Every structure is written in structure tokens, then in C-alpha cells.
Amino acid sequence: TNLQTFELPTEVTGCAADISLGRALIQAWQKDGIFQIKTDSEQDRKTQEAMAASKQFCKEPLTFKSSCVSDLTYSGYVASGEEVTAGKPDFPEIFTVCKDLSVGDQRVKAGWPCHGPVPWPNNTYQKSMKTFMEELGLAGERLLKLTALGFELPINTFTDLTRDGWHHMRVLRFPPQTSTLSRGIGAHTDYGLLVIAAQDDVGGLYIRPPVEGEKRNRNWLPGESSAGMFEHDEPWTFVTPTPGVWTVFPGDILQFMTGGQLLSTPHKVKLNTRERFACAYFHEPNFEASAYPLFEPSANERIHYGEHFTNMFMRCYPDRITTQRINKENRLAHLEDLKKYSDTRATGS
Numbered sequence: 489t490n491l492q493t494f495e496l497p498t499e500v501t502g503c504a505a506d507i508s509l510g511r512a513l514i515q516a517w518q519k520d521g522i523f524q525i526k527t528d529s530e531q532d533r534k535t536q537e538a539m540a541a542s543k544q545f546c547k548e549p550l551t552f553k554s555s556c557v558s559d560l561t562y563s564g565y566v567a568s569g570e571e572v573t574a575g576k577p578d579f580p581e582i583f584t585v586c587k588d589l590s591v592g593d594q595r596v597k598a599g600w601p602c603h604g605p606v607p608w609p610n611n612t613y614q615k616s617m618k619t620f621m622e623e624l625g626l627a628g629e630r631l632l633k634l635t636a637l638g639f640e641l642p643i644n645t646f647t648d649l650t651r652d653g654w655h656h657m658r659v660l661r662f663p664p665q666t667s668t669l670s671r672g673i674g675a676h677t678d679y680g681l682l683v684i685a686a687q688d689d690v691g692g693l694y695i696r697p698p699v700e701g702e703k704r705n706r707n708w709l710p711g712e713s714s715a716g717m718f719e720h721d722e723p724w725t726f727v728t729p730t731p732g733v734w735t736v737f738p739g740d741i742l743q744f745m746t747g748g749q750l751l752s753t754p755h756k757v758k759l760n761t762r763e764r765f766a767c768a769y770f771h772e773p774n775f776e777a778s779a780y781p782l783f784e785p786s787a788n789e790r791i792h793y794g795e796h797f798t799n800m801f802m803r804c805y806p807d808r809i810t811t812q813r814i815n816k817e818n819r820l821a822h823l824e825d826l827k828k829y830s831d832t833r834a835t836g837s
């Protein structure tokens with residue numbers, strides 16, 4: 489239950505030490521489902537400033553917080569009890585930060601689902617979150633180069649999918665437990681390549697390590713949602729709050745691309761006796777990228793990442809104005825169109 493902690497090099501070049509580190513990261517994910525990375529003073533400072541901005545925002549009146557929403561992007565506020573996981577409400581309040589695109593961006597003009605501007609509460613919160621996410625992204629890129637090297641793949645295998653990647657962050661406050669219900673967030677897996685997470689001192693995150701012989705749902709398939717799976721079955725590892733680290737675990741895309749050599753780590757949050765702040769960062773493919781099986785070149789299966797993101801956020805927030813506008817304007821049909829008639833040059837000739 490004692491997690492490994494690694495210091496990452498600032499730049500990953502493919503030298504023997506980098507390859508060795510990648511092997512160790514893979515082995516830690518395969519054993520524990522998670523590891524820690526040590527933060528330097530700037531990484532820590534930016535983490536703490538984000539947490540502080542989160543605490544200040546959550547003290548604002550509910551009507552103000554609820555105004556920070558968009559019918560174009562899922563960025564913005566989620567009230568306690570608003571998100572659904574496995575048919576049951578989750579109880580953190582959240583501020584989601586997706587790619588911040590104004591109505592001047594061609595993708596927004598074209599009505600691409602989920603594309604639009606973050607409804608920032610104020611410009612100091614904006615600066616704190618953007619600074620933090622730029623640091624988190626540098627770490628995500630290092631981790632992806634290391635992971636490629638550990639699997640004996642070209643160093644750019646995963647970073648070639650994350651140019652202009654759909655990176656996003658959930659800035660969370662869990663209330664203290666006030667009723668008989670201890671569920672903070674139900675068991676689930678996240679959707680992209682990596683999850684990098686930070687937490688305060690309170691405690692409440694649990695993760696499920698790989699279990700020999702245990703079948704894992706492929707959450708990218710509509711018939712194999714991972715939400716709720718294993719909720720009440722051991723083993724669950726408590727992620728002990730530890731100063732000076734971020735945690736890292738794989739998301740759905742890494743499970744798919746590695747054919748299950750890595751598993752998207754199931755995790756859940758239990759409410760504690762005090763309110764708890766955390767941030768979860770998602771290092772994702774480009775919205776237009778298609779993930780593919782790395783070890784089965786003849787396999788026809790693919791995951792269109794933006795389609796997976798969109799499907800997931802629609803199931804998280806079935807009644808949100810963003811979802812209503814996707815349904816009203818049939819923006820899922822435009823997602824089918826953009827697969828073949830996009831102008832961004834993110835994919836294709």
C-alpha cells in the first residue's frame with residue numbers, strides 16, 4: 489500500500505536512464521495501478537495556488553457559481569449532486585476546465601460538440617488554473633515519452649496523438665459527510681491517456697490495482713461501461729495524502745492502445761469528516777485523434793477520442809444545458825461529419 493515515487497527528468501531524450509524509468513513506471517502501474525511523481529518547488533507552488541483559488545471560488549454563493557456554465561463547452565461549474573455516475577449522484581462541487589476556445593475559433597463557429605470558452609469565475613482563477621495546467625501538461629508529455637520507451641515503441645508514439653490535445657481538469661471540493669451516505673464519487677475509470685492528480689491533507693481517494701484474472705470492462709464501448717464496477721468489492725487501495733507529490737494512473741485510451749497491458753485504473757472517492765480539495769488533470773489525445781491497438785496492427789478497432797469524451801460527458805451530465813444543446817442541434821451528427829470534412833489539419837493530409 490506504500491506507493492512508488494519517482495522524480496521525472498525535465499526532458500526525456502531516449503537515453504538508457506529514460507528507458508529504464510519507463511520500464512519502472514509500467515511495472516508500477518502493472519502492480520499497484522498508480523504511482524507518485526515528486527513535485528519541484530514550482531510544481532508545488534502552482535498546485536497550492538490552484539487549491540487556494542478553488543477554496544475561494546467555492547465560498548461564493550451558489551447562484552454565482554451556477555452562472556459559470558456554457559451551452560457550448562462542458563467547462564464550468566457542477567453542483568454537488570449534479571453529476572451522475574452509474575445512475576447515482578456524486579457529491580463534489582466541481583469546476584471543469586477544458587480547452588479554452590472563444591467564439592472566434594473556427595471549431596466553435598462550426599458547432600463542434602464540446603468546443604467553447606471556459607466560463608471563468610474571474611481572471612485570477614483563470615491565471616492560476618492555466619499556469620497549473622501548463623505545468624501538468626509538461627509532466628504529461630514526459631510521462632508519455634517514458635511510457636513509449638518502456639514498451640519499446642518510438643518515443644513519440646503517444647505524444648503524436650496529443651498535439652493540441654484535449655487536456656482538461658476537474659477542480660473538486662468534496663463536502664464533509666453530513667448524511668448516512670459516504671459516497672463521494674462512485675467507482676469509475678477516466679477517459680484519456682493519463683490522469684495526474686493532486687489532493688490536500690484530508691484523504692478519500694481509493695484506487696483498484698490490477699487483479700490477476702479479473703475481467704475489466706472497456707469503458708469506450710457503450711455495452712461495457714466501467715462506472716460502478718467493483719464498487720463494493722476488494723481490493724481498494726487508499727491513496728494516502730503525501731506532501732510534495734502528484735499521483736498518476738492510466739485512462740481508457742492507454743488500456744485500449746496497450747491491449748490491456750495497462751489498465752484504466754478504477755477509482756472512487758469517499759466523503760470524510762472534513763471538506764476535501766483535490767484536482768484531477770486529464771492528459772488527452774487531440775479531439776480528432778483515433779487511438780489504435782499498438783500491439784495488433786491488423787486489428788480494425790479504433791477509438792475516436794473526441795467521440796468518447798463527448799459520449800462520456802453527455803452521460804455524466806444528462807440535463808446540463810451543454811448536453812441539451814448537443815441533442816437539440818444534433819451535434820453528434822456534426823461529430824460524424826468532422827471525422828471526414830475538418831479543416832484543422834490535426835489529422836490527415
Ligand SMILES: NC(=[NH2+])NCCC[C@H](N)C(=O)O
Binds near residue numbers: 574676
Ligand atoms: N468527467 C469525469 N471524468 N467524471 C468522473 C466520474 C465518472 C463519470 N460520472 C462517468 O459516469 O463516467
Ligand SMILES: O=C(O)CCCC(=O)C(=O)O
Binds near residue numbers: 673693757767
Ligand atoms: O478526488 C481526487 O483525489 C481526484 C480524483 C477524483 C476523480 O475521480 C475525478 O475527478 O475524476
Ligand SMILES: [Mn+2]
Binds near residue numbers: 676677678755768
Ligand atoms: Mn476520475
